[PDB]
Protein backbone atom coordinates (compact mmCIF):
# COMPACT_ATOMS: atom_id res chain seq x y z
CA UNK A 1 0.00 0.00 0.00
CA UNK A 2 2.98 2.65 -0.74
CA UNK A 3 1.35 4.27 -3.27
CA UNK A 4 3.10 7.25 -4.61
CA UNK A 5 1.53 10.59 -7.53
CA UNK A 6 -1.97 10.02 -6.74
CA UNK A 7 -4.45 13.44 -6.58
CA UNK A 8 -7.04 13.04 -3.67
CA UNK A 9 -10.38 13.81 -5.04
CA UNK A 10 -12.55 13.28 -2.08
CA UNK A 11 -11.43 11.85 1.89
CA UNK A 12 -11.40 8.66 0.34
CA UNK A 13 -11.04 8.67 -3.17
CA UNK A 14 -7.39 9.17 -4.84
CA UNK A 15 -6.48 8.64 -8.76
CA UNK A 16 -3.38 8.36 -10.84
CA UNK A 17 -2.25 8.11 -14.60
CA UNK A 18 -1.06 4.47 -14.58
CA UNK A 19 -1.30 0.95 -15.49
CA UNK A 20 -2.40 -1.28 -12.81
CA UNK A 21 -0.49 -4.10 -13.97
CA UNK A 22 2.40 -1.47 -13.50
CA UNK A 23 0.64 0.10 -9.98
CA UNK A 24 0.17 -3.72 -8.47
CA UNK A 25 4.00 -4.95 -9.19
CA UNK A 26 5.70 -2.15 -7.77
CA UNK A 27 3.28 -1.30 -4.73
CA UNK A 28 1.98 -5.10 -3.69
CA UNK A 29 -1.15 -4.03 -2.13
CA UNK A 30 -3.59 -5.59 -0.05
CA UNK A 31 -5.86 -6.17 -2.89
CA UNK A 32 -5.83 -5.32 -5.99
CA UNK A 33 -9.60 -5.21 -8.07
CA UNK A 34 -10.10 -6.93 -11.60
CA UNK A 35 -12.89 -6.05 -13.70
CA UNK A 36 -14.65 -9.48 -14.19
CA UNK A 37 -17.46 -11.33 -15.56
CA UNK A 38 -19.61 -13.72 -13.48
CA UNK A 39 -17.35 -16.75 -15.07
CA UNK A 40 -14.34 -15.30 -14.13
CA UNK A 41 -12.96 -15.55 -18.16
CA UNK A 42 -9.76 -12.94 -18.10
CA UNK A 43 -9.93 -12.49 -22.00
CA UNK A 44 -9.92 -8.96 -22.29
CA UNK A 45 -9.66 -5.01 -20.86
CA UNK A 46 -7.85 -5.20 -16.93
CA UNK A 47 -8.74 -8.75 -16.33
CA UNK A 48 -6.77 -10.22 -19.31
CA UNK A 49 -4.15 -7.65 -18.84
CA UNK A 50 -4.11 -8.89 -14.68
CA UNK A 51 -4.04 -12.47 -15.84
CA UNK A 52 -1.35 -12.09 -18.33
CA UNK A 53 0.63 -10.66 -15.77
CA UNK A 54 0.43 -13.56 -13.46
CA UNK A 55 1.05 -15.72 -16.78
CA UNK A 56 -2.22 -17.73 -16.26
CA UNK A 57 -1.86 -18.40 -13.26
CA UNK A 58 -5.08 -16.06 -11.81
CA UNK A 59 -7.00 -17.93 -14.53
CA UNK A 60 -6.74 -21.33 -13.83
CA UNK A 61 -7.30 -20.84 -9.68
CA UNK A 62 -10.17 -18.65 -11.30
CA UNK A 63 -11.59 -21.93 -13.02
CA UNK A 64 -11.37 -23.89 -9.96
CA UNK A 65 -13.18 -21.41 -7.90
CA UNK A 66 -16.16 -21.74 -10.79
CA UNK A 67 -15.95 -25.72 -10.62
CA UNK A 68 -16.59 -26.12 -6.97
CA UNK A 69 -18.68 -22.38 -6.48
CA UNK A 70 -20.43 -21.48 -9.73
CA UNK A 71 -20.62 -18.41 -10.97
CA UNK A 72 -20.50 -15.01 -9.84
CA UNK A 73 -23.79 -12.60 -9.67
CA UNK A 74 -23.79 -9.24 -11.75
CA UNK A 75 -22.76 -6.77 -8.67
CA UNK A 76 -21.16 -9.92 -6.79
CA UNK A 77 -17.31 -10.60 -5.84
CA UNK A 78 -15.04 -13.33 -4.69
CA UNK A 79 -11.39 -13.27 -3.05
CA UNK A 80 -8.85 -15.05 -4.53
CA UNK A 81 -5.29 -14.68 -4.11
CA UNK A 82 -3.61 -12.04 -5.90
CA UNK A 83 -0.38 -13.80 -6.51
CA UNK A 84 2.63 -11.76 -7.80
CA UNK A 85 0.36 -8.49 -8.11
CA UNK A 86 -0.87 -8.41 -4.33
CA UNK A 87 -2.02 -10.25 -1.15
CA UNK A 88 -5.38 -10.76 -2.21
CA UNK A 89 -7.42 -10.03 -6.11
CA UNK A 90 -11.19 -9.08 -5.43
CA UNK A 91 -12.99 -9.70 -8.81
CA UNK A 92 -16.20 -7.54 -9.02
CA UNK A 93 -18.74 -7.82 -11.79
CA UNK A 94 -20.13 -4.82 -12.60
CA UNK A 95 -23.03 -5.17 -15.16
CA UNK A 96 -22.49 -4.92 -18.89
CA UNK A 97 -24.53 -2.52 -19.93
CA UNK A 98 -23.90 -3.29 -23.83
CA UNK A 99 -25.85 -6.30 -23.16
CA UNK A 100 -28.65 -4.92 -21.12
CA UNK A 101 -27.41 -5.13 -17.58
CA UNK A 102 -29.03 -2.66 -15.45
CA UNK A 103 -26.84 0.37 -14.67
CA UNK A 104 -27.95 0.27 -10.72
CA UNK A 105 -26.15 -3.01 -10.64
CA UNK A 106 -23.19 -0.38 -10.94
CA UNK A 107 -23.52 1.09 -7.11
CA UNK A 108 -23.99 -2.97 -5.80
CA UNK A 109 -20.86 -3.50 -7.54
CA UNK A 110 -19.03 -0.73 -5.65
CA UNK A 111 -20.63 -1.60 -2.18
CA UNK A 112 -18.11 -4.94 -2.07
CA UNK A 113 -14.94 -2.10 -2.08
CA UNK A 114 -16.08 -1.49 1.38
CA UNK A 115 -15.48 -4.53 2.60
CA UNK A 116 -11.61 -3.65 2.30
CA UNK A 117 -9.93 -0.91 4.29
CA UNK A 118 -7.61 -0.25 0.92
CA UNK A 119 -7.94 -1.07 -2.56
CA UNK A 120 -6.41 -0.32 -5.58
CA UNK A 121 -8.86 -0.55 -8.34
CA UNK A 122 -9.79 0.18 -11.89
CA UNK A 123 -12.85 1.88 -13.00
CA UNK A 124 -16.12 -0.49 -13.00
CA UNK A 125 -18.38 -1.17 -16.21
CA UNK A 126 -15.94 1.32 -18.29
CA UNK A 127 -14.32 0.15 -21.32
CA UNK A 128 -15.64 -3.35 -22.87
CA UNK A 129 -18.71 -2.90 -20.56
CA UNK A 130 -19.68 0.05 -22.06
CA UNK A 131 -20.91 2.25 -18.95
CA UNK A 132 -19.52 6.17 -19.68
CA UNK A 133 -16.45 6.24 -17.04
CA UNK A 134 -17.02 9.41 -15.64
CA UNK A 135 -20.75 8.18 -14.69
CA UNK A 136 -18.79 5.05 -13.10
CA UNK A 137 -16.16 7.57 -10.73
CA UNK A 138 -19.47 8.93 -9.78
CA UNK A 139 -20.96 6.09 -8.59
CA UNK A 140 -18.07 4.67 -7.11
CA UNK A 141 -17.42 8.53 -5.11
CA UNK A 142 -21.10 8.38 -3.77
CA UNK A 143 -21.14 4.55 -3.07
CA UNK A 144 -17.54 3.57 -1.41
CA UNK A 145 -16.47 4.11 1.80
CA UNK A 146 -13.22 2.71 2.18
CA UNK A 147 -10.13 4.24 1.01
CA UNK A 148 -9.62 3.27 -2.90
CA UNK A 149 -6.73 4.14 -5.51
CA UNK A 150 -7.65 4.53 -8.69
CA UNK A 151 -5.55 3.82 -11.64
CA UNK A 152 -6.41 4.88 -14.74
CA UNK A 153 -4.39 3.92 -17.98
CA UNK A 154 -5.46 6.52 -20.63
CA UNK A 155 -4.76 10.04 -19.80
CA UNK A 156 -6.66 11.73 -22.01
CA UNK A 157 -9.46 9.79 -20.01
CA UNK A 158 -7.66 10.64 -16.87
CA UNK A 159 -7.58 14.54 -17.59
CA UNK A 160 -11.28 14.34 -18.28
CA UNK A 161 -12.05 12.42 -15.04
CA UNK A 162 -9.84 15.60 -12.80
CA UNK A 163 -11.46 18.00 -14.81
CA UNK A 164 -14.77 16.98 -14.33
CA UNK A 165 -14.10 15.99 -10.47
CA UNK A 166 -12.33 19.00 -9.45
O1 LIG B 1 -8.12 3.12 -17.04
C1 LIG B 1 -8.51 3.09 -18.28
O2 LIG B 1 -8.04 3.78 -19.16
C2 LIG B 1 -9.57 2.04 -18.54
C3 LIG B 1 -10.98 2.51 -18.13
C4 LIG B 1 -11.72 1.24 -17.73
C5 LIG B 1 -10.74 0.10 -17.89
C6 LIG B 1 -9.35 0.75 -17.72
C7 LIG B 1 -8.17 -0.10 -18.16
C8 LIG B 1 -6.98 -0.07 -17.45
C9 LIG B 1 -5.90 -0.81 -17.83
C10 LIG B 1 -5.96 -1.63 -18.97
C11 LIG B 1 -4.89 -2.43 -19.43
C12 LIG B 1 -5.06 -3.20 -20.54
C13 LIG B 1 -6.28 -3.18 -21.20
N1 LIG B 1 -7.31 -2.45 -20.82
C14 LIG B 1 -7.17 -1.67 -19.70
C15 LIG B 1 -8.26 -0.88 -19.28
Redesign the pocket.
Known sequence: NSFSGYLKLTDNVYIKNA???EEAKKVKPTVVVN?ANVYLKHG???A??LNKATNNAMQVESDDYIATNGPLKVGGSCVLSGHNLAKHCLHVVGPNVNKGEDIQLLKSAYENFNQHEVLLA???S????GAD?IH?LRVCVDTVRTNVY?????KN??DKLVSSFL
Request: zero cysteines; charged letters at 10%; glycine letters at 16%.
Open positions: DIVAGGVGAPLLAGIFPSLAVFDLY
